[PDB]
Amino acid sequence: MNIIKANVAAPDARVAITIARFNQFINDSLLDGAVDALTRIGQVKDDNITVVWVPGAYELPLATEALAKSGKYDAVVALGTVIRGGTAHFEYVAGGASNGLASVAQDSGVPVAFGVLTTESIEQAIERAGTKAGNKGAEAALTALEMINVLKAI
Amino acid sequence: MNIIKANVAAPDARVAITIARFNQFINDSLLDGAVDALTRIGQVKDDNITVVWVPGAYELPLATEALAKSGKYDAVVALGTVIRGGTAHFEYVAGGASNGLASVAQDSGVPVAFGVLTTESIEQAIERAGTKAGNKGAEAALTALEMINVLKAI
Amino acid sequence: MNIIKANVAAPDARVAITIARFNQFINDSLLDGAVDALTRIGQVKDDNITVVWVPGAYELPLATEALAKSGKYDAVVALGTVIRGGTAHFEYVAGGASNGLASVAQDSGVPVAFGVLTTESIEQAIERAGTKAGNKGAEAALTALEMINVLKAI
Amino acid sequence: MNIIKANVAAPDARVAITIARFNQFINDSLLDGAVDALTRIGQVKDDNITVVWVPGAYELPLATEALAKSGKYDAVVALGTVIRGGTAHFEYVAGGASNGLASVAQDSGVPVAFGVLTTESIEQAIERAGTKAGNKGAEAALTALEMINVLKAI
Amino acid sequence: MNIIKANVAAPDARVAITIARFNQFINDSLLDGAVDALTRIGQVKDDNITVVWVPGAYELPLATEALAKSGKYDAVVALGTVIRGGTAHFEYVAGGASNGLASVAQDSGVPVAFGVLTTESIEQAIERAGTKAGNKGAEAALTALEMINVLKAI
Amino acid sequence: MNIIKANVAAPDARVAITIARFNQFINDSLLDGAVDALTRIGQVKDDNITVVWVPGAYELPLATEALAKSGKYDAVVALGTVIRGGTAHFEYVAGGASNGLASVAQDSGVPVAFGVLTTESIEQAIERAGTKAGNKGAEAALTALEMINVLKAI
């Protein structure tokens, strides 16, 4: 029985990271995590890393499509933060950028990390971006990498 | 009146099983169920079974597309576990991987088992992965098989 | 005054372990315990251990009768898990498989370990199958062994 | 270490199904499940299936004894439904027909499926005979078959 | 300004993993995590991994001392689980095995991963050994590795 | 991948058991357990067992140091009982005799079993010294033994 388990190192790969500046104070750690994990752990040279900055998490898709489409990159790490509020705007943003980044994947064949925090409080976000419960940004990068070699393994 | 009822044996197909390592402690039984049911019940030789390991349940799709697309396999058994928490991350993961694996089906013609536990507690998950209420992993495999022969029957 | 105290080592005797796959996620540790204790502690060679897998705990008896009857084995370790639910099905299963395995004993002269968890929750079962309160599976094996030498001592 | 895991297919075996007509409205699905699972999954020819109809679940034993005793059949699937009521009649029926079918097993060596619903409501029974929580009738048949090959494996 | 950041790969150094069998049902995943992360992520060959099995978490120290002392190994991953109960036994065990493994470090110069779950429920432990909140076992190994190269970097 | 699993038999090695007479009515079973398990299970000859009686559990350490130090013994089983009361005397005793026996270990290389009940009631102690929840005294001896062979295995 043949099994495919893939590691998170991939010294070559050119990875593209996209980020929303809205909720910067939180998305900024997400990048730090991502990049660190990318180089340090994934053996990626820091010039095979390009970082595209779109305004809001709602724009993450188009960005990560023009990227993956381009072809130059082996994976895109999508980094954003959406914290619910007064209205169900959160609903449509978080969603249109989940279903978004998701469709960009299935249409490009390029793996894309859903590094988008969809929470309820700054409290929860600060938890999931460096403190108590990890740093999804980095995670997103590792899962990015891994997926690179996984797809490669077929 | 002609009726199509198909059995779960198919000691001929090559099945591909994909799995998220996140929630391993629970997804691991899912695999055990799947594989057992696959061979034991489905008469499948254990070298026509390949098992691809992606990080998270969010990645199950791309994996199961590269697989089905490939052509080598007659069906893909998707195995993952998503248990709700503080935020509606659960929402987007579970969803983007349900609608995901769903689309991979209708676009590849390759049957795909939705063996993804979408629950509320480790309590519920442990129920649905071996104990009280069956072992969806195995089920997923049987439904996988059956569907193989069902499709074949047209 | 002559006293009979018997140890748990018995590197010769061939032990047969029977197991219900229902509640696999719990019964599986029961087996691990059983086997470890059997070899490691009981000095049993791992080819004098045969493991029969019946569907449900209700079937444990017939299995462990055909075994003991057979004669080849020196003791049978019965391993199953029954957790109560909506109806008193638990009642009849647990019972018909307690009184069952019991009768197989008195009619075969072959010791049989009642390694069947009869509980109320997955919580309680997980306690009694490796965690907080031991690992009845193993226990069942040791009591199995000991009994071998105890009977022998008469 | 030698392990016995047995499949649910068994072409040449002749299975005898017994059924109580009391609670027909519920037992009837039990039969449908049983038979379907018997042929479809177990590869059993529908003329090696005989179906004996006794009045009440209390009678299931004698029926399933004269059957197994007879010898012609490789296993008996016992199908009935007992739903508690005003008195503890349920107690004695369900019991005398659990311990019953149990004894018929250990004395005939012929596996017998305990496909008898012992519940509290039509609600629970309808759950356990086709809807929400499976279709014990079918299950009873599969466990029946499996046991056939399991015993055979010794 | 010179900075020391170290990666988690180290395909040459021989790691020793120690484990308490008490709370097996939980410590077993701890091992699975550890090992996977060790090889898969850390590039460690699976014969440079030795696994010592002590009875209880209280014994973890002496084991991990005889190991590190020995010299053959570059790091020890300590894996155990202690879940509080009726008395403050938990107190002394968890403690004497924290301060324990700690002292073994500072006296051997060999890094040691504190992969010992000190919780309040099987619920919490199952969270911290594969499911909801990661798999400390794996973590312990990565921190183990990293520390190898960190120390090396001085 | 090389694994070290050790059994509890060790008919050579000379074990020294130490015991507090305070709480005799409870510690006495602790000894019975210990000794039984030692000989019966561990194959230890009853003249390779010496039993030192110190007044209180606070004294257990010095006793078990002069012993291990001595060299004649292969392991020390420490047996005492401390049940909390009006003041936090319990605190300092239980502690100074946990940390105590712990240090004697790491400084002598001689395994030492922490067979000291640290409870809240005679109720709890009677549970943990023969009745409901085992007989820690015996346990302490087995873990003693096992550790002997475990250390030996390096």
From Swiss-Prot, chains A, B, C, D, E, F:
Gene Ontology molecular function terms on file: 6,7-dimethyl-8-ribityllumazine synthase activity
The organism's place on the tree of life at top rank: Bacteria
EC main group: transferase
Keyword flag Repeat: no
Gene Ontology biological process: riboflavin biosynthetic process
A GO cellular component entry from the record: riboflavin synthase complex
Active site: residue positions: 89 (proton donor)
InterPro entries (alphabetical): LS, LS/RS, LS/RS_sf
Assigned keywords, A-Z: Riboflavin biosynthesis, Transferase
EC numbers: 2.5.1.78
PANTHER family xref list: 6,7-DIMETHYL-8-RIBITYLLUMAZINE SYNTHASE (PTHR21058:SF0), 6,7-DIMETHYL-8-RIBITYLLUMAZINE SYNTHASE DMRL SYNTHASE LUMAZINE SYNTHASE (PTHR21058)
Function: Catalyzes the formation of 6,7-dimethyl-8-ribityllumazine by condensation of 5-amino-6-(D-ribitylamino)uracil with 3,4-dihydroxy-2-butanone 4-phosphate. This is the penultimate step in the biosynthesis of riboflavin.
UniProt protein name: 6,7-dimethyl-8-ribityllumazine synthase
